[PDB]
RNA sequence: GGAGAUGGGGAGCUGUAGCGAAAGCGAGUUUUAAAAGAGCGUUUGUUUGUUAUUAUAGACCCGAAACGGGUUGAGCUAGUC
């Protein structure tokens, strides 16, 4: 993928860069991502909610 | 490790060949003298999320005279001193 590099001032560099495979997929799936975000919201409770 | 996903940790479980109680045998096993017959065979996947049902935990919930253990009780009242 074609990318650019920025500096501390806030200006782009003068040389782009490509990216080799390793994080680019050809498949599609959202239900895995759906349960991923759901379990991300999980592990946040601590059982404080309780009554007699 | 923000008590996180995750990474590591393959301990174990499913199916991968089964027959029966077994010595054991094995695409055959056991019953039988049977190579007769019959049975079972003759791979057809795993883990989660979810829904419903079922199993135990009070398990839709309300309800009794119940039972057991402990405890206050002679000033009402019974008897006695």
Curated annotation (Swiss-Prot):
Q: Provide this UniProt record's keywords sorted from A to Z.
A: Antibiotic resistance, Ribonucleoprotein, Ribosomal protein, RNA-binding, rRNA-binding
Question: Which part of the full protein is shown?
Answer: 2 to 53 of 212
Keyword RNA-binding belongs to the record: yes
Q: Name one GO biological process term.
A: translation
The organism named in the record is Mycoplasma pneumoniae (strain ATCC 29342 / M129 / Subtype 1) (Mycoplasmoides pneumoniae)
The task this protein performs is described as: One of the primary rRNA binding proteins, this protein initially binds near the 5'-end of the 23S rRNA. It is important during the early stages of 50S assembly. It makes multiple contacts with different domains of the 23S rRNA in the assembled 50S subunit and ribosome. Forms part of the polypeptide exit tunnel.
Q: Name the gene that codes for it.
A: rplD
The terms describing its cellular component in GO are: ribonucleoprotein complex; ribosome
GO MF entries? rRNA binding; structural constituent of ribosome
Subunit description: Part of the 50S ribosomal subunit.
Protein's name according to its UniProt entry = Large ribosomal subunit protein uL4
Family classification? Belongs to the universal ribosomal protein uL4 family.
């Amino acid at each position: 993928a074609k990318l650019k590099l920025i500096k501390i001032d806030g200006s782009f560099e003068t040389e782009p860069v490509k990216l080799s495979p390793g994080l680019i997929a050809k498949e599609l799936k959202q239900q895995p991502v759906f349960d991923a975000v759901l379990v991300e919201q999980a592990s946040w409770r601590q059982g404080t909610h309780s009554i007699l």
